[PDB]
Structures are given as C-alpha cells and as structure tokens.
Amino acid sequence: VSPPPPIADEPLTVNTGIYLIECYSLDDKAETFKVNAFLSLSWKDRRLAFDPVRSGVRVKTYEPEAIWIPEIRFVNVENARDADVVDISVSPDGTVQYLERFSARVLSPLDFRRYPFDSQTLHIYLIVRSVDTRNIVLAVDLEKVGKNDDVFLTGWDIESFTAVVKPANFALEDRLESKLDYQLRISRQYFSYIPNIILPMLFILFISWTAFWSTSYEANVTLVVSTLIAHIAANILVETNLPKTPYMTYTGAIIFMIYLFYFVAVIEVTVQHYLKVESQPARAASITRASRIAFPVVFLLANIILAFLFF
Amino acid sequence: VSPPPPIADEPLTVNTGIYLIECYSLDDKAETFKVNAFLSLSWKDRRLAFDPVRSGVRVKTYEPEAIWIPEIRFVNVENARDADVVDISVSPDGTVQYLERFSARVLSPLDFRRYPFDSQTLHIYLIVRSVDTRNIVLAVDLEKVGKNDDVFLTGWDIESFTAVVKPANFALEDRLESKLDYQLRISRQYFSYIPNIILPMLFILFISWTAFWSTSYEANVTLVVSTLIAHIAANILVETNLPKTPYMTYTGAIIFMIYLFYFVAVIEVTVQHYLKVESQPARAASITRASRIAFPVVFLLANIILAFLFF
Amino acid sequence: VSPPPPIADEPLTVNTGIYLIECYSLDDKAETFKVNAFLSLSWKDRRLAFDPVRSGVRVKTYEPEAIWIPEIRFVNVENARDADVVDISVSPDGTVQYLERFSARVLSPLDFRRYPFDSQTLHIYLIVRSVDTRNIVLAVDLEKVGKNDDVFLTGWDIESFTAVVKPANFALEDRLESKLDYQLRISRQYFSYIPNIILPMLFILFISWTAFWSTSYEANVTLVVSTLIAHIAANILVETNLPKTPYMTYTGAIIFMIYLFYFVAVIEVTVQHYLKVESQPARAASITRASRIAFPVVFLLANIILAFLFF
Amino acid sequence: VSPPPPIADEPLTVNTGIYLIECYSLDDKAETFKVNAFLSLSWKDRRLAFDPVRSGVRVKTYEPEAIWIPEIRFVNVENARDADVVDISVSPDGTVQYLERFSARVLSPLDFRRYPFDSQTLHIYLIVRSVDTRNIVLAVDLEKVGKNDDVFLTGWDIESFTAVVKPANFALEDRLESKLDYQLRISRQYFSYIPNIILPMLFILFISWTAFWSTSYEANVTLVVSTLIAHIAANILVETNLPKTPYMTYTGAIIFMIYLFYFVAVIEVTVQHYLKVESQPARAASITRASRIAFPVVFLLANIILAFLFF
Amino acid sequence: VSPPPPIADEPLTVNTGIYLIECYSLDDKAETFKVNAFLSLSWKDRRLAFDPVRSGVRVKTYEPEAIWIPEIRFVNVENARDADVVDISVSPDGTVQYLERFSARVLSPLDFRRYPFDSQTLHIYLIVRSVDTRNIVLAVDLEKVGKNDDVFLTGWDIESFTAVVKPANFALEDRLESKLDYQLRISRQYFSYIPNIILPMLFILFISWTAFWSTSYEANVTLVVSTLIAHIAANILVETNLPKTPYMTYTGAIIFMIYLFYFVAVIEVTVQHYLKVESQPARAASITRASRIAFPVVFLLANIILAFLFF
Ligand SMILES: CC(C)c1cccc(C(C)C)c1O
Ligand SMILES: CC(C)c1cccc(C(C)C)c1O
Ligand SMILES: [Cl-]
Ligand SMILES: [Cl-]
Ligand SMILES: [Cl-]
Ligand SMILES: [Cl-]
Ligand SMILES: [Cl-]
Ligand code: NA
Ligand code: NA
Ligand code: NA
Ligand code: NA
Ligand code: NA
Ligand code: NA
C-alpha cells in the first residue's frame, strides 16, 4: 500500500472522468450548487499485473483497502465528498479502472452583471498531491466525461459539461499539485422574470406617470408616492434573491434608474402645484405637458443606453 | 465475496420491491420529497445452497458482510440512502431474500402548469451496475411493491404506488446498467387555496371596480392603487411557494391577467377625471357606465379562455 | 447470536417502555416533534440463564454485540433513532433487561380544525418484525412508561403519556409485525393569541365600522381599504404558521368571514356615496344608520354560529 | 470493564467539572443555546492502582476502551454530546483523571416576563445512572468548574458559571440517578432596543397624536390609521423574535396597550368629525383639547403602572 | 502510542501551518465563517527513526493510528473540524511531516461600529494540551502558512492571512496549553450599499421635504407619513442583516437620526396647518420657508458630525 514504482523517472498519470447523474440546488446568494456524479479513475500499477492465460480470468476485482488508490480531492467543495466505491477492476497489464459515485456541494462564483439574462460557467476542480516516491499528474479521459440526459437544474438550461484536458501543475508547500478544470456551462431561463417582475414593475411606473394628466396635487402625491412604495417592495424582493456584488448588475442599474424617475416625478408634481398656488398655471401646464413626452422618451433612451452597456 | 457464477450465459435477475412506510416533506420549490420505505431484494446464489434434511433447518440467516449482495442504488437521490438491513434469509435452493429499511430525499421534477389543480407522478429509480463476471438485470416482484394505509403527504392525495415491470437496460461508462421506475401518483388538495388566496384576491379586485360608481378622482386613485398594492402582496406570497418555471402556470396567468385589469382601471380613472376637468362629463359618464359592464364581462370571458387553455 | 428457541410453539414477548426525558421542536407546518427518551426492552433468553448460588452474582452485565437483542424500530420517524445503550442486565432465569437512551424526530399529523383552541394526540409507534425461527410480539410494561416532570413543550400543556397495551399484530411482506401505540396528549396554550392576533384583528375591523358614522366618501374609502390591508397582513402572518389543510379551520373560517365584512362595508360605502351624488341622502342615511346596528349584530351572530359548528 | 468494587458498602463518587471554551447561538424562540466545553471526571478505581517505585512512572495513561469510565450524560440536551477524549491519567492510588472536550445544543427555558430588560439562568444538567454492582453519586470539583475570558454570547452579558455542589439523587426506573446542576447566569444587553424599536415606536404614536391639533377628518384618518399600520409592522417584527408564552411579557403588555391608544384615538377622531357635521364644534373642540392632555398623561401613567407591575 | 521521550528536559515543538483553500459563508448576525484549509504539523519522534539503506525507502509513510500524533484542536470552533489526513511522512531522523485537509465553522466576533465601511480581523486559534510525560509547545512554520489566490469571500476583500509566531503558553486545569493565533484580515465591499440602501433612503427623505413647498395639510400628511413607512421598511431590512450590538453602529446612528428628521417634519407640518386655521399664515410661511433651508443644512451638518465621530 504505497504508490506504484516508476519504470524510468516518469510521473504517474491518473486518467479522470466525471459523469453527472444529478444537478440541483443552485443557490445564487451562496454561489453554490449540489452535484451527484460518477468519478472514474485510471492508472497503471505494474505490481497488480497478471498473465490472463495462466490466471484463467481477464480481469481481477479488488476492494479499496487491498490496493493503492490515488488521493483525489475536489478544490472548490464546502466539505469532503460523500463517496461510495462502485467498482475496482484490474486488466492484465496492471491498469486499474476505479469507479465511485459521489455527492458534493460545490463553491463556484457567479457573474450577475447580466442578470436575469446571464450565462454561467460552473467549475469542478479535481486535484492530486504528489507523494515522496513519485509525482502524480492528472489527465482527462473524454470517454468517461459526460452527463445524464435527465440532468435538470431548476430555472437553468444546461448547455455542456466539458473538461480542460491540460492540467494546471503547480508547487504547493514544497510538493507538486496537478489540478483539472471540469466546466458545466449553464444559461438562465429568463421567461418567468417578464410576467412576474419586469412587466408589473413597468405598470406601477406607468401608473405614476398618470399624474402628468392631473392637476390635483392630493391625487398626484398619492399616485407617485404609493407606486414608489410598490417599487421599494419590488427592490427588496429582487435584492434578497441576489448576493451583494462589488460591481453593478443590469437589474440593479434599472431598479436604481427607476428610483430617479420617481424622484424627478415628485419634483414635477411639487413644481406643478407650487405654480398653481402662485397663480401661474400656464407655466405649470407647459411643464406637465412636456413631462408627458419627456418621461417615456428619456426612460426608453436610458434603457437603450443601459442595455448597450451591459449587452 | 464475488457475484454468483452463471449456469449457462444468462444475466442475474435481482427481483426488487419498495413498500412505502412514510411519505413526507414535498418541497415544491426544490422539487424534492422525503421517503421512508422497505427495499426487498431477491436473487439466486447457488454457492449458498444447502440440503434441508442434513442441515436440520429450512432457512439460513446471514449477516451482510458474510454473503454477496448486489450494489443497488437510487438514481434520483440527493445523497446515498440511509439503510438498516432488516433480514437476509437463504432458502435451500440458494435463493436469497434480502430486506432493508431505508430513508432518502428523492429528486422528482413537478409540472406546475395546472397549479393548484395539478396532479404529479413522483419517481423512484432503482439501478444496478453489471460486474465483469456477469450482467445484473433488475425485476419487479409486484407482491413486495406497495404502501402503508397511514402514508399521508401534507396537502396531497396519494392515488397509487406502482412500478414499471420492464427495466430500462442501457450502456453507461462501457458497462450494462439495469434501471427500474417506481411511480407514486399524487393529486393536490386545492381546497385551502379557495378561502385563503382565490376569494380574497377576487374581493380586492371587485373593490377596485367600485371606482366605476364614483366621480371622485381622489377616492378612485386610493381605491385602484391600494388594491393593486394588496395584489402585489398576494403575487409575492404565491411566487415564493413556487419555483421559476420556463412555462406559464395557470395561477401565473391569472395573477398576470389581474395586473392588466388594474392598469386598464387606472387608465379609465385617469380618462374619467381628464374629461370632467375638460368640462365634458357626458363622455366620461358613458365610458364609466360601459366599464361597469365591460370589466366583469371581459374578466369572466378571459377566465373561461384561460381555464380552457389549461384544462 | 440468533433468536432464543421457544420451549413449546409460543411467540417471544418483548416488554417495552418509553420514558420521556425531553420534548421539543413541535413544528405545526411540518407536523413533526423532536423527542429525547429512554427505551426499555425486556425478553426471556433461556440460553443466558445461570444459577445465582454457584455464580455468586445476582445479575450478569453484557455488551450489545455479545447477546441477541430484538430489532425494535419506530414506524413514524423521519430517520432511524440516535441511540446509546445505557445498560444490559440478565437475571438468573434468563430475563434480559435492556435500556437505551434515544433521540428521534417523530412524524405525527395534527388536527387544526379547532386552532388555536385545539388539543393533539402525538403518536410514537414501536414495531418488531418476526424472524424465521420464531414470531416476536410486543408488550407494554406500564412501570417503565412515563415522563420527566421538567418535560416542557413551548406553547403546549402536556396532559399524559400512555401506551395502548394491546399491540396491532399484522402481516407485512409475508412476515408478522407487532406494532405498539405510545400516545402523548397535549393541549395548546391559547393565551398569547388573544392580545397578539385576536384583539388587534377585531380593533382594525371596528375601526373600519367608523365609516358608518361618516358621510365623507374620501375618508370612508381610506378607512375600510387601509384596515383591509392590515387584515391581509394578519391573514398572511397566520396562514404561514399553519399547513395547508383539506378541511376548514376555526381561525380560517373567521379570517375568511372578516373578508366578507370588509367587502360588504365597501359596498355600503359605495352605495352611500352614489345616493349622496344622486341627490337622495335620506335613502343613504337610513342605510348607513341600519349598518351601524346590522354589522355588529350579524358579526356577533355569525361568530356564535361558527363557534357552535367548531366547538 | 465493570464498575470498581466498593471497599465497604459506599457509593462511588465521581467528581465532575465543566470549563466553558465557547458559548454561542442562544435561540430565544427555541429556548436553546450551543456550548463547547471541557468535561473533567475523577473517580477511584483500586484495580488500576500501582506502586510508583516498581513501575518507574508516577502516572499511567490509558485509552477509553482499556478502563471502566462512568456513563455520564446530559439531561437537557437535544442529541447526545459530540465528545473527543483529551486525556485519561491514573495516579498510584488508583484515582482516574478523565478529560474530554464536548459540544452540545442545550435546552433551557427562558423567562421573557421582563424582556428586553431580562436576566436568565441557563442550566446544564449532568447525570449518572447507578449500575447493578454499586451506586454512582456525582460531586462538584470547584477547581475544574469555570469559563474562558473570551467566552461571549451575542447580545448578552455573561455574569457567572457556577455549579450546585449538592446533587439531586433520585429513583428512576428502579435505579438511583445522581443529577448535578451547572448554572450559567446571563443578562440581556438592552441598548440596541432603545434606538431600533422603543423610540421609533414612540415617535409613530406621537405622530398619531397630532390629529388632536387638526380639524381635518380626512387628514386625521390618514394620521391615526397609517401610524397603526406602522405599529402592526413593529408588532409582527417583535413577536417573531419571541416564543408564544402562556404569561404576559413587559413588551407584550406595552404593544397591546399602544393598540388601545390607537383605537381610542380613532374613536376621538370619529366623535370630533361627527360633532362638526352635526353643527356643534364647541363640544368637539373641548373633547379634542382635553385629548391633547389626556392621551400623554394616561400613557405616562399606564407605563408607570406597567413598569411597577413588571419591575 | 504515547508522546516521544525528551533527550534532555525540553518541551516538544510542533510546527504548524494553515493554508486556506476555500473561504465562505461569513454570517454577520452569527459572527461565524466557514473555512476549508490544509493543516500541516511537524514534530521530531526519534522512535520512528530508520536506516534508509536497510528499509529500502528514503521516506516512510504511516497511517494515523500507527504513530503518535499531537492532539491539535481549534479553540474558536462550533464543532470539532471535519478532517481527512492527506499524508504522513517520516524522514530517517524521525521528523514527522503530517498534512490534513479540514473544514470548520469558526466563531470570530465582528466590529460593526463602522458598518458598511468596516474592516475585520478573523481569528483561527490552534491549541495543544501538554501531556503528563512532557510539555507540547506550538510553533509557526511561515513556509506552510498562506492562501490560494482564488480564495474569495462574497462581499469582502481578503487583505492578508498571517500568524502570530509567538504562542500564548498558559496554565489551564493544572496543565500547560500552547495557543497560536492565525489572523485573516478582510475589508467590506461597500459598493452595493450605495445604489441599494443609501441613495433610495436619501431620496424618500428628500421627497418628505417637498411638504415645505406645499400648504395642503392633507397632501403634507400623506408625504411625510408614507415616506416614514418606507424608512421603517428600510430600517427592518437593515437591522435583520446585523446582530444586536451593545454599542452604536454608523448605520444605526444615521437610521435613528433620520427618524428624528421625520418627527420634526411632522411637527412642522402640524404647526404650519395650525397657524393657517388660526388665520395667521405669515407666521406659518416664515417657518415653512426657514425649514426649506434648515432641514438640508442641519442634516448635512449632523452627517458630517456623525462621520467624524465614526471615522
Ligand atoms: C389567534 C389566531 C389563531 C385567531 C384565532 C381566532 C380568531 C382569529 C381572528 C380571525 C379574529 C384569529 O386570527
Ligand atoms: C447601506 C446602509 C448600511 C447605510 C450605510 C451608510 C449610510 C446609510 C444612510 C445614509 C442611508 C445607510 O443606511
Ligand atoms: Cl473532496
Ligand atoms: Cl442510493
Ligand atoms: Cl427507528
Ligand atoms: Cl450527553
Ligand atoms: Cl477542532
Ligand atoms: Na487503498
Ligand atoms: Na457482500
Ligand atoms: Na445483538
Ligand atoms: Na470503558
Ligand atoms: Na496517533
Ligand atoms: Na390619502
């Protein structure tokens, strides 16, 4: 129970492969996702080699404790994976074919810049630490890298699950470390966001703009202020389903922009009333009539500007 | 231990059976449900066979570690099942009768299209991976497939728990995989939804329609706007108890439709007031009188259209 | 390590007893409760018998692995109990006295029909599966069935903890199953509900009825509508602390009834205003004066009707 | 591996000691707190005695499985403690000095009568069950009872951690049980409650009292009703951070009292308006002028009465 | 399996090192953070010495149970760390090089005085208890102390991860304890707080100040009261994401100060109206005109005073 000895002075290549069985619980706020998959490992151990003609069997099955197995770990995991060894098969040349079924909560940062029209690249980093006898290098066996067709992630479209074939070999605490990158590309299902958040938020804003077709300050105050309270409720609802980003998000920009539109509408409503009391409604009517065109035009213009800056 | 050797070149049939003891925690947002059940397994191992006459005993009881047991796993589970082996009995012909009691959180997608008048088909997928010595095929023993009469799922009616007798045999990572489908059919108890969400949401909408029997713009603004705020509160309450679907739900359609009715009511209230100020209330009175009939008629019409499209 | 052999052809009686140490976490929505208790088990194993005179000792102490112990399980538990064996004592006749301390989350449905003036019967079902050698039957040893005096359940009064002495013996998967019923009777502490939810909800309803002593439609709309928003807030607060029941609850009935009172008050307020505008306030004043008596009388009458139907 | 034999007919005294390392997660609603501490145990086992001269060593170190250790449990815990044995030392006379580091979620009821100006006495109950060979009695070794200086409980001031030196010896299931009481005295940090809940709640109430300096019923309705909605929001916020008590709390009393003040203010506002419409404002002005003095005086008076009844 | 014997009378130096792999879940309310890191331990055990010539290997690999490993614990952890031993290597002199990968929830108090423009010093305390044979002293091996470049903490900037090289050696329960301090310095990413909470909270306050450009008491009441309700919503949203501190926070001060500004605005609105009714609007106009300048000036002044007191 030690690493296999090298024939010359070559590092031990451990061929890896992750096959996704179940994908679930993508927490946007925590930037984590739960995964249930197969982990396949393959290496050459010449000490386990046998003659197939004399043995009578073409493959030998071993228990994990009986043979040497590379200590393969995941970098971006909360806790160590819950694994159950499925099978260990040894071919006559000494090539081990290890398979285990694992479940782990993976930590992968998300880019909310384009939310809810955003795409993500979820990562799963495989790692091996080189032993004192010899160095261990990871490899990708594309034949054993894939996903089940049933694999569904609620509110997401699963594009592809590939692996960066070239490992990131580096020094860590005076020992070699071979790191592999498994990438799960996903795109957000933005459909629900339109009738649930986008359109209701636009309607309450358009309702506040009816104050531009009214001279009643008491009714105008009620219109602009109440709809602002509805927008504050909408802002709270959205910001709780998202983490605190050091960058501006597309939704964050719009929500903040809408706050300015309510503030400027309050100013207009205040100015309109002040001029009516000061016995000059001709100045107020012209401002109110201008606002009827200005508010939707500037809103459409600014939205085009924002959409261009983000997409 | 190792798999039992085949007499000819036949695959090993492992007869299965799931008997539900407890069903609980159906998370709609997570599309998961917790289950506590019996898992019965039966296979022929000729190496364990004995003569009942000289043994003196008709059945031999073994501990799990003593004999070979097929590695039976669940496909759609978050983590590996928590199992406690109940009994292992061996008949004289070598037929093993294994029984275990398990508990597992099962991942099964739900169809919210008809919510809260929806029915679901919960799945439990049993799976076995074929070994190098011989292939393992799963079978359904209908005698050991059932459920306890006490089995209750909060807010759901349990119809039936059956199994698709024919297994889905397929190739996975260069090995045969035998997959069985256990189906738990349930229907939602929609009763509570009527006095808690449906009727209160209709009442607040009918209260907004009283603005069609009033000329006071200040009172009308207060009526339509405040009731809209109540509907926004109701929308938030409903959408949090449901996951983000790429398709339209029945409740989602109604909620969204009601938003249009509030918006058009605001427009009516705005138009009515604008005409009263412009000294033409005959035009306003006729629009307001038409709305008294139009709003309930178009609402009833659209609801019939929606109910037909969904049911 | 097999069951004790029968002297004749009698089943093995395993005397049980549950002594509650701690009762906590009664989740109304989940219909679950956490329990920490002692589980006492007693059976006759003649193979363990000894002469007290020759042995010099009255009782022999064994480790769980050394002797045969019946596989006692709980039916209505989420996961298998966390148990620590306290003591195993054997008397000279071969009678084993087993004791363990366990902790388990128990699933017991609750009847919310009379909430918050409801009483519950929490269940703990003990079960044993008969082995092939002989049948195992459960029994109640009332001496070892009880509870600690400190045992407290937050917001509940603990009446009694008894056991149904006669077991439910039945056939399951071609084997005998002996099931015992341990009942924990509790009654809800309804005190808090009066100053926190009942009285504040009645006050906001009485505030809406002040519109019957006002002719100002603008003020009346504000009165009835705002108080309705407060009642919607109260409805949301209550319904979240309760699960979705297929039956009507006492609180559910009142909340729904109060919604009708707000709707009819809106109708009255609308009718009153319509008649004032139509230049016939004598008709409006008489309706408004009638409502001053009708609303509290019909409310008190309907509450008496509801209380009678539920209690 | 059995209890040490008595020299005469004396019970075995097991000297205990708890040294708090970390105190955290005091859940007020659940009435639980998490603790990380050292558990020291000391007893005399003459079978383990040795001559220091012949042995060459003054102290013998044993592994838990090698020697007999008393089964010490905690009464008021959710689940059995997570313990790691630190050290087991045996002096030449046979005195064992056991030490372990544990972590456990402790259930201790809290008295919310004086909340948020309340003090609590958290309990940790140590217990031992007497074996058949001899009786086990617990003792307090004050030298090994203490706490770390860094020990902090968020929003609480830690006064003292002492132990009731005299154990509660009692009979349970025909066996002796020795119970010890470890008391952790804490007092609530009420500072935050003043600018966050107390003062904002008083301000909204004083804002409602401005209706006593106004004749506008429409403005008065808006004043008293809106501020009541703010108080309902405050009531919901407070009651969620507290469990449902069968007794009245200090905060509960104030919140409920404030509801009466809003109701009486609505009555005043209603009466004032009714008299203005009935063409008798001299009666209304006198009532309104009286209320300007009555409301703050009766509020201050009732608060003094309440503070006296609770403190 | 006992500590290594000293050559003279020197304490055993155990060289430590923590290398952060993943940093996540910084709960502000709980004052906890989750960490996934490498724990390296190195000590001299002369009993494990070997001749590389005779053994055939330059470095001997052992399993944890085979050799003596110092009982290294963390002080400020909720529960004992979840560790997986990576490697144990022994050089021919007997120097052990232990490595494990751990995951633990660390308890570290935070200073919210400057929130959300605050910086924190997270602590990780390593500790060893001296055995009876010899004393164990901890040391820092700066070569094995570091962090991964990918290490990200959501909403935080990771400055440095260093260790206090000099251990805190002290007496505890009559035994020596060597304590090391690993410090993770972080600074809050305050960006999000500006468009999400700061600016929307300032806008609603400026909207309330429009009442200084209006004589309509009914509109003014609606303005100041509704915006106060929005500020109460904002206060609740902020205070839930923060724990109850016995000290004043920067955000806590501003929120509380804003409450005074709303109260004084209500007083102004009340005074203005009272004077208009008392037929003296010249006194009211002058107060209202003064408030137009006073409110923004005093607000800016007080904010400068607060920012100076906190920064
Ligand atoms: C406290 C709560 C559960 C409750 C009980 C009884 C009556 C009501 C209202 C509807 C008056 C109520 O909300
Ligand atoms: C974002 C939040 C924590 C906060 C920080 C700083 C200042 C304010 C006020 C001025 C809005 C504030 O609420
Ligand atoms: Cl891992
Ligand atoms: Cl499984
Ligand atoms: Cl169980
Ligand atoms: Cl314990
Ligand atoms: Cl630890
Ligand atoms: Na191995
Ligand atoms: Na086996
Ligand atoms: Na046993
Ligand atoms: Na022992
Ligand atoms: Na060791
Ligand atoms: Na109003």
DSSP C67: S
Interchain contact B66–C (C-beta under 8 A): no
Nearest to A193 by CA among A303, A114, A309: A114
Q: Which of A244, A245, A239, A208 lies closest to A223 in space, CA to CA?
A: A208
Calpha distance B26→C107 (Å, rounded):
14
Instruction: At A280, give phi and psi (nearest 5°).
Output: -145, 65
B44 burial via Cβ count (<10 Å: 0-12, 13-18, 19+) = middle
Buried b or exposed e, range D24-48, using 16+ CB within 10 angstroms: bbbebebbbbbbbbbbbbbbbbeeb
Q: Do B24 and C107 touch (CB under 8 A)?
A: yes
Q: Do D266 and C207 touch (CB under 8 A)?
A: yes
Count of residues for chain E? 311
**Is the shortest distance between the CB of E238 and ligand 2 below 6 Å?**
yes
A218 CA → ligand 13 middle, Å: 7
Domain co-membership, A124 together with A8: yes
With 0-12 CB in 10 A as exposed, 13-18 as middle and 19+ as buried, what is C55? exposed
How many angstroms from the chain centroid is the CA of residue B190?
A: 14
C310 and C271 assigned to the same domain: yes
Technique used by the depositors = X-ray
Residue D36 contacts E, CB cutoff 8 Å: yes
What are the backbone angles phi and psi of residue A76, rounded to the nearest 5°? -85, 55
Q: How many domains does chain C have?
A: 2
User: Please, which chains are in contact with E (at least 3 CB pairs closer than 8 A)?
Assistant: A, D
Among A192, A227, A248, which residue terminates a domain? A192
Output the CA–CA distances (angstroms, integers) from residue B301 to A269, B193, B256, B294, C240, in the order listed. Answer: 38, 22, 16, 10, 33
Q: Is the minimum CB–CB distance between C290 and chain D shorter than 8 Å? A: no
Query: Is D273 in CB contact (< 8 Å) with chain C?
Result: yes
Residue of D nearest to E219 (CA): D219
Same domain, E80 and E162: yes
Nearest-Cα distance to chain C for D235, in Å, is: 8
Cβ contact A254:A306 at 8 Å: yes
User: Would the CB atoms of C196 and D235 count as touching at under 8 Å?
Assistant: yes
State if residue E306 touches ligand 2 by the CB under 6 angstroms criterion.
no
Ramachandran angles phi, psi of A206, nearest 5°: -65, -30
* Partner-chain residue, chosen from B61, B82, B230, that has the shortest CB–CB distance to C79: B82
Q: Nearest C-alpha of chain C: how many angstroms from B209?
A: 10
For residue E40, the domain's CATH number is: 2.70.170.10
- CA separation for the pair E269, E288 (Å, rounded): 8
Nearest to C22 among D76, D247, D266 (CB): D76
Q: Is E292 helix (H, G, I), strand (E, B) or coil?
A: helix
Measured between CA atoms, how close is A85 to chain E, in angstroms?
17
Residues E117 and E223 in one domain: no
The ligand 1 atom nearest the CA atom of C117: 5
Looking at the structure, do residues B112 and B79 belong to the same domain, yes or no?
Answer: yes
Residues of D in contact with C234 (CB under 8 A): 232
Quick check: E222 and D222 CB within 8 A?
yes
The tokens for B300 are 């009833």
Using the structure block, give the residue that is written with the tokens 């004084």. Answer: E264
* Residues near ligand 6 ion, CB 5 Å cutoff: D 73-74, 80-81
Report the C-alpha gap between E116 and E187 in whole angstroms.
10
Write D67-71 long-range contacts (CB < 8 A, 24+): D67/D1, D67/D96, D68/D1, D68/D2, D68/D3, D68/D4, D69/D41, D69/D96, D69/D98, D70/D12, D70/D14, D70/D41, D70/D43, D70/D128, D70/D136, D71/C86, D71/D128, D71/D129
**Distance, CA C85 to ligand 6 centroid (Å)?**
12
User: Which of A126, A158, A192 is the endpoint of a domain?
Assistant: A192
B298 and B243: one domain?
Answer: yes
E222 in the same domain as E159:
no
By Cβ distance, the residue of C217, C235, C266 closest to B207 is: C266
Closest-approach residue (CA) in chain D for C60:
D132
In this structure, are D102 and D23 located in the same domain?
Answer: yes
CATH code of E297's domain: 1.20.58.390
C39 burial (CB, 10 Å; 0-12 / 13-18 / 19+) is buried
**Which residues in chain D are closer than 8 Å to E218, comparing Cβ atoms?**
216, 218-219, 222
- Please list every residue in chain D whose beta carbon sits closer than 8 Å to the beta carbon of residue E263: 203, 206-207
Point out the residue among D154, D207, D215 whose CB comes nearest to the CB of E263. D207
Q: How remote is the CA of residue B128 from the centroid of ligand 12, in Å?
A: 39
| Pair of tokens at residue B265 | 């009511």
Beta bridge partners of A186: A120, A158
CA distance C45 to C62: 13
Q: Is B71 on the interface with A (CB under 8 A)?
A: yes
Using an 8 Å Cβ cutoff, are B186 and A186 in contact?
Answer: no
Chain B: give the shortest CA distance to residue A196, in Å.
7
Contact E210 A248 (CB under 8 A): no
Residue D210 shares a structural domain with residue D159? no
| E48: number of Cβ within 10 Å | 19
Looking up tokens 């009153």, which residue turns up?
A: C272
CB contact set of D225 (below 8 Å; sequence gap of 6+) = C207, C222, C223, C226, C227, D266
Asked if residue A72 lies in contact with residue A129, where contact means CB atoms within 8 angstroms, the answer is: no
Q: Which atom of ligand 1 is nearest to the CA of C254?
A: 10
Ligand 1-lining residues (CB < 6 angstroms): C 115-116, 193, 197-198, 201-202, 238, 251, 254-255, 258
Q: How far apart are CA C103 and CA D78, in angstroms?
A: 7
In Å, how far is D229's CA from the nearest CA of chain E? 9
Are E222 and E130 within one domain? Answer: no
Name the residue in chain D with its Cα closest to that of C82: D79
Phi/psi for D194 (5° steps) reads -70, -65
State the residue range of the domain holding A26.
1-192
The last residue of a domain, from among C157, C192, C227: C192
Chains adjacent to B (≥3 CB pairs closer than 8 angstroms): A, C
Q: Do residues E31 and E180 both lie within one domain?
A: yes
CB A259 within 8 A of CB E203: yes
In A109-138, the residues whose Cβ lies within 8 Å of chain E are 109, 129, 131-133
Report in angstroms the alpha-carbon separations of D36 from D32, D100, E33.
Answer: 14, 11, 17
Distance between CA C310 and CA D27 in Å, rounded? 35
Residue type, E60: K
The answer to whether residues E299 and E261 touch, using CB atoms and an 8 Å cutoff, is yes
* Domain shared by A34 and A154, yes or no: yes
d(CA A139, CA E80): 35
E7/chain A closest Cα distance in angstroms:
29
Contact B235 A24 (CB under 8 A): no
Distance set, CA B267 to CA A272, A290, A295, B284, C124 (Å): 21, 19, 17, 12, 61
Structure tokens that stand for B93 in this block: 């012909």
Distance E76 CA to ligand 10 centre (A): 40
Closest among E38, E93, E82 to E60, alpha carbons compared: E93
Q: Please name the residue whose Cα sits nearest to atom 3 of ligand 1.
A: C116
CA quadruple D14, D19, D23, D28: dihedral sign: positive
Tell me, yes or no, if B154 comes closer than 8 A to chain C by beta carbon.
yes
Relative to beta strand C156-172, strand C175-188 is antiparallel
Entry resolution (Å): 3.1
